[PDB]
Design a binder for this molecule. Structure first.
Ligand code: CDL
Ligand code: CDL
Ligand code: 3PE
Ligand code: NDP
Ligand code: SF4
Ligand code: SF4
Ligand code: SF4
Ligand code: ZN
Lengths: 114, 140, 349, 239, 123, 181, 117, 156, 123, 136
């Protein structure tokens, strides 16, 4: 359904900016800029998905080695503007916040089969 | 009255049209909501662009939208119908029906789940709760 | 490829000090840099104006009154260009709020009939006083105010009286306002000029139609208005926008009837009975012909010679007879060699 | 005999292997005898029409005859009419451009004899302006295909009733499936409010196309590989 | 030479305003493979105003130039020139640069220095 | 006859119970018809997100490929062992008609045989001249079949049809559709 | 509070919405685009809108600094990032960190600092 | 090959569906096959002669509507359809009614396939053997240096 | 597709230039007779002689073309455009592709010299 | 089933006040067993009864007159859609994910002024010069 950027236990963003979700996306929905932050750790400055050209193939979830972006089973998020349907880094971190209890249930049953 | 009777024109043309025929199916019924496909735009309240929009159909999509009587809405079903979609960088495609028709509810999903299309319908009916056609004339 | 036709240049600086680098080629997905607030953008003139304005990517700020009309503006700009926000004329926070980020701002708030909420004094000079007081407070470059033709304070018609009063009050508050005065405006589904003559059961008046006014096409008024909007030569100047040749109403109705090929009705009953009839029809919710619009059937096109025409901003307005055929097309109704040629086809199978 | 007393499927002994054994074998090995039969058949077809068959190629149970464009109509009739061939059904015909060749387009014809259960390919060539003749007098179903190969490729079919565009826009200037035509194309469509019609404009995107072909491998990823040629149809070494 | 620019459906502005370049791709300094350095690429020089610009909204790289993504591969140099002037285009051609052959020996690494050593190898 | 009618208690459907079953055996066209609804405790219990089998699952593999030590990958790759297109000109078929074959070479004096190959390799003889010079035994051995007949258009696995006629057919007699097996 | 919107006009937003997150005031990247620049750039469309129902999701650079530092007796400190209640392969690929220099060395996937003792 | 393995308990479920679908399709067959309205509306409509069905390039149910016994999964078989036993319906008159009657029986033959493949399903790998054309499992690529290289290259 | 469309012509390639000249002559006659049909059919604003002078001008574009083969592809494309326009398959929004400059003046500030092109760097 | 006896007996079991509330809520009359309640406040029920079709067993009773599908909590959303057998009341603490921050739950605010707005997460790509003059 909609997209979510998960977090580690004890709160760390999980997206190491490896650009693999961008390179595989068959409809070019992902756009990322990445910079080395103050810690010297590799993180994304900008993460972004256009949900008007996403096609829900799940390659972005299959490709990530850290398993940072996933697909939550929410389909009930229909909007009234296009601007609302463009998801930056902050909307997706809030989704991966909100659905984390549920994504536990999804990846407890999926992760052997992946 | 505008909610409990709710008549779309069955414009759906591609992948997302079968997913609309699952809203006509006996598991997720639309008759139980008041929804029926009057298949002529002269009688439909609303339109559903459910599928792609090529450059050969953009005047046809507008001529179907031009005809419907004046309390009219439109919901955009699918990801090919808002912002091009899977075919965004193609020579013969319109990058969403936002360019052609003024759309009120966007339903996202490439096959946007019959759950999610019905949720877009409930969102449009909520927009019909606060239309305020008679309070507006009092100039609120 | 596309091109920025409205701009003289790439890099434009405002009068307030903001620096505006226009990006890219012309067209939908490009951005000019300007932020514009069009009041009354659901109106007849305002729809063409913000069509032309969001065509090149100027960010249009639309304060709307009702939620159901404004939908037809969202198609005319790119994603992110046109921004709708609700506004009543009574709440000063919303007028304060709509013009806050605008590089230019125009109002076209003008209502021909009195309401239960607003008289002519409420919409034409007090609403303009509120908007112009906001524009003075926020230091907005290029406030432009549209007012009617024949807008003077000495006139007995209330409409024209309070338009002249609205012009004087927006001259007092903001000295740098361009004030623009267009002629009668014919367009597609217009207000009272051609849409009224194409469908009217009776077409009743006073004056025996002999008032003189010339009509201007509305894409011409919107083009002239946007060509005002961007050059700084037109600061604190009053503009007359009148068409090429002067008409009378019976001449216009003969021109409409010769293209319809139908005889439009004519009544011409006296003025006082007509006035009492309009007084009777004021008590009904849908917009009816005004009773002070009876007084404007006598007042003709009085042009100020101390003003600037289409000739200044390099435009030639299109004439009414060349464009009558297109706007009157839907109400149009529609020997022996055929019968010598139809004796070879088959008609019964 | 009730629906509550029905047995459940979920508790029963299910089959369990400790370990699965699958032998490994080249899937090209199963073709080899039929690929030799296909060689001998094609050598006969070349010996039957020497005026019209320039070459052939057998890949792996896939036969392709290599024929000049002025030689299209005499070969196809043979493939329809000879009892040994009987390639009745047209399957799909199309074009492929190689811009490095002088004759830019090649035109491929696929046939299927439903009698003999066999497929065949026929390849010819055509430049942008010079034609290739149409086989639609032979086949009633070919012409739509020919006409599709018109609109994407601009290849002509001389002797064709109803040659015009299909499956593109009516006022479309260009031929899409062609290497000089860009992906997003030349024009775009919006609804002009002024003119109250859609207008066709030059192209402009809100996100530019980023191809990721720049960044392919710099090591030659596959080898030359072996051959399926039988010992009968390669030239003898002397001594 | 036949002139096919009027029958391809390409606009006039592409043939009269845009200059194109034939080039063989250089061997990358990063990795030691040479596989992408055989085919002659055809690629268009960019337009000053039309290339790319940052979106106000998000930061999307939006373009007005449409040939920026197209790029062709050819077998030979002559085929690229023939096609480029057959389609009516103004081209510049860039000559490739190979490395100079210099004979290497491993036994060069430790030859006897009669005078000053003037170097210390390390391996 | 193996796939024939089975009664409705082997069909996993909610059915009916009690006196209402005796009612619907009377009021029916065929009594062994389900009602379409799946049985709630049987159909999809436990739900796919809560399965005891997901805890024990492990990646499958076959033995000569998951083997830790006996295979090298180059023995068992077949992407790199792809075969090539056997592209044959008209002149190499003249070579095969006049030089011969590697199965049956008609070439003596190999040092002169290379020169005998070379003029065909340059285009000495023609293909029609190669067919005319060729003996009747060569034409009937390698161009034609050994009986003198043209070679049949080859198929990989031939299919022999067998029409099923009787009570094992899918439609009985009088319907215009037949089953062909 | 009052930031200048390109015209001398002051715009006024609450102080709880100028923070990058309610963990951290300032920016953690050289191109992070601080919130005051964001509300300065497009305030045209924060009009008539609630700021509180915007996401604002807990910056992670501060939630990792408050985690303790693990101590390893050996030379090499090995890391998964995995849970061990979860039936499967979660977390990041296993990497092995040399802890020899003074200080605590961080995991480049998870940021958990390891120190030799 | 295949994306990933079946879920844990689907094979016992496709049987439970098939047992009732065999009756759910007899019922749709009742009000169409021997309707006189549905018959009369579809009797000599759309008639295709067998020699014209080949020149037009027609195949599948329209070529097998018209008499010619040809289908690829029997004639040139692939993907383990040789190991699975079924029959084929082929009409005799080229009409829309024999194109109808052969669709109604390919339901039957397909349900026969589903049963014979539920019974005879073996164990083993579901994707191809090697990690140079499709990806390693996520158990392996988080442990294996070779498989992380292959995973990172099959997607970029 | 036994029978063809109404105003169709089997495409046929002429080896002489004078036969091609006769066919383009007949084709100009066919466009020119059908211009009142186009003005009625697409509900255009302007007069029939503007369609007729558009037809003349589009033949004025390709007058000095030498190559007979290119004249042949150009003739076949023109007859296809005629068959689309006369049968009413093209719509009024693609019929008015042919008239981009008549329908509206695009705006002020048309750049002609180097300076007006420079101030907007060609837009 | 669609019988009158089922709606009659469920109306008797649930009681008349909650019957009137479920009738203004849904068309059906349902008797469940209170599996749990939501952090937003939404009671959920599961049905024992024999005459229930598949996908009828579990349901929500909302709190507001204006209800959404987006108003149900994430861990409960997967259970109402029959993804998990065990409700998030009865799951162990091992399958509770560890967090280092508080939870918020914004449902959906489309049309509401609290709708999401998108923006640039990063600053413009190429910086300009801040001018300083020089006395020569
Ligand atoms: C109940 C009956 C209906 C009530 C009226 C409804 C109405 O007026 O809507 C009009 C409405 C007006 O359209 P509009 O959009 O306002 O356009 C106005 C014109 O553009 C141009 O407008 P105009 O300038 O020509 O002015 C038109 C004016 C025309 O006025 C005149 O010409 C008369 C002039 C005489 C003046 C002097 C009178 C004498 C002094 C009297 C003193 C008092 O007519 C009016 O609008 C009268 C307004 C008052 C209506 C009173 C309603 C009372 C109930 C509430 O027209 C429609 O909605 C058409 C709907 C489609 C109906 C077509 C099918 C009808 C066929 C039925 C035939 C039945 C035959 C039975 C056998
Ligand atoms: C005449 C109708 C005759 C129907 C025959 C019985 C069918 C049946 O129920 O078998 C169920 C049986 C399956 O039962 P089940 O699903 O296993 O168990 C559910 C139980 O029965 C548990 O469900 P239930 O049987 O207890 O159904 C509840 C029923 C109580 O139980 C009954 O079914 C009644 C006892 C059956 C005698 C029929 C009297 C009811 C007549 C309806 C009019 C009500 C007044 O409650 C009612 O009577 C509802 C009436 C409420 C008043 C409606 C509002 C006013 C309507 C005014 C009517 C006048 C205008 C029409 O299905 C079949 O056996 C196949 C039916 C074969 C039909 C053949 C053609 C029948 C003759 C033509 C009828 C034309 C209409
Ligand atoms: C069931 C509901 C039926 C009763 C509807 C109650 C409506 C309450 C309206 C309160 C009266 C307010 C008022 O002063 O209305 C005056 C109105 C004309 O006012 P205005 O908005 O200016 O329109 C002028 C355009 N010609 O003129 C009118 O509003 C007249 C409306 C009369 C409707 C009578 C319906 C019976
Ligand atoms: N013949 C003509 O058309 C002439 C018109 N003009 C002037 O041009 C301007 C627009 O002309 P035109 O397009 O024809 O008519 P309009 O329909 O545009 O006039 C009304 C416009 O202003 C809005 N409006 C009216 N009253 C209010 C109010 N209290 N508060 C907020 N908005 C209000 C309307 O909102 P909403 O859209 O919801 O209705 C509408 O947008 C007017 O100022 C008019 O005086 C000049 C001379 C002649
Ligand atoms: S979400 Fe995954 S694939 Fe995407 S950049 Fe982050 S780690 Fe890489
Ligand atoms: S689901 Fe597919 S299209 Fe969407 S972001 Fe992931 S890979 Fe791209
Ligand atoms: S939105 Fe998706 S399913 Fe629908 S037509 Fe487009 S690609 Fe197909
Ligand atoms: Zn780690």
């Amino acid at each position: 359904g909609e997209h979510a950027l998960r977090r580690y236990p004890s709160g760390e963003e999980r997206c190491i900016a490896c650009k693999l979700c961008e390179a595989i996306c068959p409809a070019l929905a992902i756009t990322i800029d990445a910079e080395e932050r103050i810690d010297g750790s590799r993180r994304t400055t900008k993460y972004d998905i256009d949900m008007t050209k996403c096609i829900y193939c799940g390659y972005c979830q299959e490709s990530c080695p850290v398993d940072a972006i996933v697909e939550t089973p929410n389909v009930e998020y229909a909007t009234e503007t296009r601007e609302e349907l463009l998801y930056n880094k902050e909307k997706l971190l809030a989704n991966g916040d909100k659905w984390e209890l549920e994504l536990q249930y999804a990846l407890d049953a999926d992760a052997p089969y992946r | 009255a505008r909610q409990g009777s709710f008549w779309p024109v069955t414009f759906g043309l591609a992948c997302c049209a079968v997913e609309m025929m699952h809203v006509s199916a006996p598991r997720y019924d639309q008759d139980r909501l008041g929804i029926i496909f009057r298949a002529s735009p002269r009688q439909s309240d609303i339109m559903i662009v459910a599928g792609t929009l090529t450059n050969k159909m953009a005047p046809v999509l507008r001529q179907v939208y031009d005809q419907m009587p004046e309390p009219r809405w439109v919901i955009s079903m699918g990801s090919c119908a808002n912002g091009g979609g899977y075919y965004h960088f193609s020579y013969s495609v319109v990058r969403g029906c936002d360019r052609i028709v003024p759309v009120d509810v966007y339903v996202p999903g490439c096959p946007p789940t019959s759950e999610a299309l019905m949720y877009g319908v409930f969102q449009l009916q909520r927009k019909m709760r606060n239309t305020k056609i008679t309070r507006m004339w009092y100039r609120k | 490829m596309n091109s920025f036709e409205n701009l003289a240049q790439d890099v434009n600086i405002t009068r307030s000090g903001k620096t505006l680098i226009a990006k890219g080629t012309g067209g939908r997905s490009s951005r000019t840099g300007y932020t514009a607030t069009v009041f009354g953008a659901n109106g007849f003139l305002g729809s063409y104006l913000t069509a032309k304005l969001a065509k090149h990517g100027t960010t249009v700020v639309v304060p709307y009154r009702e939620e159901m009309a404004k939908r037809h503006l969202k198609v005319t700009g790119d994603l992110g260009v046109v921004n709708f926000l609700e506004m009543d004329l009574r709440n000063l926070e919303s007028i304060d709020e709509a013009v806050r980020h605008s590089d230019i701002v125009v109002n076209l708030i003008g209502r021909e009939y009195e309401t239960k909420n607003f008289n002519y004094y409420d919409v034409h000079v007090e609403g303009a006083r509120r908007i112009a007081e906001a524009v003075k407070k926020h230091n907005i470059a290029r406030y432009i105010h549209v007012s009617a033709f024949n807008a003077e304070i000495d006139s007995p018609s209330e409409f024209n009286h309070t338009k002249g009063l609205g012009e004087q009050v927006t001259k007092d508050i903001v000295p740098w306002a361009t004030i623009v005065r267009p002629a009668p405006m014919f367009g597609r589904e217009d207000k009272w000029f051609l849409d009224r003559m194409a469908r009217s059961p009776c077409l009743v008046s006073a004056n025996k139609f002999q008032e003189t006014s010339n009509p201007v096409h509305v894409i011409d008024v919107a083009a002239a208005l946007e060509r005002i909007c961007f050059d700084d030569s037109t600061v604190a100047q009053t503009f007359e926008l009148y068409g090429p040749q002067k008409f009378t109403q019976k001449q216009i109705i003969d021109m409409v009837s010769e293209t319809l090929r139908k005889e439009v009705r004519h009544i011409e009953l006296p003025k006082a009975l007509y006035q009492a009839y309009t007084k009777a029809t004021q008590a009904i919710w849908w917009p009816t012909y005004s009773p002070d619009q009876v007084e404007r059937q006598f007042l003709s096109q009085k042009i100020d010679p101390s003003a600037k025409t289409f000739n200044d901003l390099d435009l030639t307005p299109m004439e009414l007879p060349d464009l009558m055929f297109k706007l009157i097309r839907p109400y149009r109704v529609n020997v022996s060699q055929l019968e010598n040629k139809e004796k070879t086809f088959v008609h019964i199978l | 005999p009730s629906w509550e007393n029905i047995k459940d499927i979920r508790l029963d002994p299910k089959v369990h292997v400790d370990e699965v054994y699958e032998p490994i074998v080249n899937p090209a090995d199963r073709y080899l005898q039929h690929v030799s039969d296909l060689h001998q058949y094609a050598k006969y077809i070349m010996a039957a029409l020497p005026k019209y068959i320039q070459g052939f190629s057998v890949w792996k149970d896939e036969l392709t005859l290599h024929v000049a464009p002025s030689a299209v109509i005499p070969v196809t009739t043979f493939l329809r009419d000879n009892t040994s061939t009987q390639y009745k059904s047209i399957i799909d015909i199309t074009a492929v451009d190689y811009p490095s060749r002088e004759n830019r387009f090649e035109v491929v014809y696929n046939f299927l004899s439903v009698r003999h259960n066999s497929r065949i390919r026929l390849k010819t060539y055509a430049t942008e302006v010079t034609p290739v003749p149409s086989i639609t007098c032979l086949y009633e179903g070919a012409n739509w295909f020919e006409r599709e190969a018109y609109d994407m490729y601009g290849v002509f079919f001389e002797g064709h009733p109803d040659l015009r565009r299909i499956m593109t826009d009516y006022g479309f200037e260009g031929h899409p499936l062609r290497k000089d035509f860009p992906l997003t194309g030349y024009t775009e469509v919006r609804w002009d409010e002024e003119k109250r019609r859609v207008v066709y404009e030059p192209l402009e995107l809100t996100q530019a196309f980023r191809n990721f072909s720049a960044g392919s491998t710099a090591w030659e990823p596959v080898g030359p590989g072996r051959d399926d040629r039988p010992d009968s149809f390669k030239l003898p070494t002397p001594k | 030479v036949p002139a096919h620019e009027i029958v391809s459906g390409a606009p006039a502005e592409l043939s009269r305003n845009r200059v194109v370049r034939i080039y063989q791709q250089a061997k990358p300094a990063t990795q030691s493979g040479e596989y992408g350095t055989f085919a002659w690429r055809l690629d268009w020089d960019i337009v000053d105003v039309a290339n790319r610009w940052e979106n106000d909204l998000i930061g999307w790289q939006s373009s007005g130039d449409y040939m920026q993504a197209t790029q062709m591969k050819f077998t030979s140099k002559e085929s690229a020139i023939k096609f480029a002037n057959k389609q009516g285009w103004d081209f510049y051609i860039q000559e490739p640069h190979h490395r100079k052959f210099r004979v290497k020996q491993y036994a060069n690494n430790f030859v006897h220095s009669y005078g000053k050593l003037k170097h210390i190898r390390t391996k | 006859l193996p796939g024939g009618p089975v009664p409705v208690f082997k069909k996993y459907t909610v059915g009916s119970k009690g006196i209402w079953e005796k009612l619907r055996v009377l009021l029916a066209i065929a009594p062994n018809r389900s009602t379409g609804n799946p049985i709630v405790p049987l159909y999809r219990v436990p739900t796919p997100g809560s399965r005891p089998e997901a805890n024990v699952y492990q990646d499958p593999s076959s033995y000569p490929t998951n083997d830790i030590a006996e295979n090298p990958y180059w023995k068992r790759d077949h992407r790199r062992a792809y075969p090539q297109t056997a592209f044959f000109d008209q002149k190499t078929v003249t070579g095969l008609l006049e030089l011969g074959s590697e199965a049956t070479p008609r070439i003596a004096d190999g040092e002169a045989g290379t020169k005998a190959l070379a003029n065909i390799a340059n285009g000495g003889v023609s293909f029609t001249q190669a067919l005319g010079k060729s003996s009747k035994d060569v034409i009937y051995g390698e161009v034609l079949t050994v009986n003198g007949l043209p070679p049949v258009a080859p198929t990989l696995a031939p299919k022999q049809w067998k029409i099923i006629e009787g009570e094992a057919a899918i439609y009985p007699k009088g319907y215009p559709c037949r089953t062909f097996h | 509070k009052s930031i200048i919107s390109y015209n001398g006009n002051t715009i006024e937003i609450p102080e709880e919405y100028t923070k990058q997150a309610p963990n951290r005031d300032s920016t953690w990247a050289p191109a992070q685009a601080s919130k005051t620049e964001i509300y300065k750039n497009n305030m045209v469309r924060f009009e008539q809108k609630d700021l509180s129902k915007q996401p604002m999701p807990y910056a992670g650079i501060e939630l990792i600094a408050q985690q303790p530092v693990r101590f390893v007796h050996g030379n090499t400190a090995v890391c998964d990032g995995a849970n061990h209640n979860g039936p499967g392969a979660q977390g990041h690929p296993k990497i092995f960190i040399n802890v020899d220099a003074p200080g605590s060395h961080a995991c480049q996937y998870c940021g958990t600092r390891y120190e030799k003792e | 090959g295949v994306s990933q393995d079946l879920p844990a308990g689907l094979l016992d479920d496709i049987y439970m569906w098939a047992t009732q679908f065999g009756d759910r399709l007899d019922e749709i067959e009742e009000l169409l096959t021997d309707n006189r309205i549905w018959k009369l509306r579809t009797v000599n409509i759309g008639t295709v002669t067998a020699q014209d069905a080949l020149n037009l390039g027609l195949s599948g149910p329209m070529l097998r509507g018209s008499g010619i016994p040809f289908d690829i999964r029997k004639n040139a078989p692939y993907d383990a359809y040789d190991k699975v036993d079924f029959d084929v319906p082929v009409g005799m008159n080229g009409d829309c009614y024999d194109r109808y009657l052969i669709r109604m029986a390919e339901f039957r033959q397909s349900l026969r396939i589903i049963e014979q493949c539920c019974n005879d399903m073996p164990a083993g790998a579901v994707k191809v053997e090697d990690f140079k054309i499709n990806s390693p499992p996520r158990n392996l690529m988080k442990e294996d240096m070779e498989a992380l290289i292959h995973h990172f290259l099959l997607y970029t | 597709a036994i029978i063809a469309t109404a105003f169709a012509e089997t495409v046929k390639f002429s080896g002489s230039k004078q036969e091609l000249q006769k066919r383009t002559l007949a084709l100009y006659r066919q466009f020119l007779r059908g211009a009142p049909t186009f003005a009625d059919l697409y509900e255009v604003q302007f007069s029939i002689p503007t369609i007729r002078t558009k037809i003349r001008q589009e033949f004025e574009r390709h007058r000095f073309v030498d190559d007979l083969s290119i004249q042949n592809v150009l003739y076949a494309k023109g007859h296809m455009e005629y068959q689309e326009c006369i049968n009413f398959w093209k719509q009024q929004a693609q019929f008015l592709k042919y008239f981009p400059e008549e329908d509206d003046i695009q705006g002020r500030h048309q750049p002609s010299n180097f300076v007006d092109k420079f101030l907007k760097n060609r837009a | 089933s669609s019988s009158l006896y089922r709606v009659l007996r469920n109306a008797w079991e649930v009681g008349p006040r909650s019957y009137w509330k479920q009738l203004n809520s849904i068309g059906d009359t349902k008797s469940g067993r209170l599996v749990g309640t939501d952090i937003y406040g939404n009671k959920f029920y599961e049905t024992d009864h024999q005459d229930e079709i598949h996908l009828r067993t579990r349901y929500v009773e909302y709190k507001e007159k204006d209800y959404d599908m987006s108003q149900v909590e994430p861990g409960w959303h997967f259970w109402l859609g029959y993804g998990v057998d065990t409700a998030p009341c009865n799951t162990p603490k091992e399958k509770l994910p560890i967090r280092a921050y508080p939870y918020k739950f914004q449902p959906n605010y489309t049309g509401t002024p609290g709708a999401f707005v998108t923006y640039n997460t990063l600053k413009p790509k190429i910086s300009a010069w801040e001018p300083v003059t020089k006395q020569r």
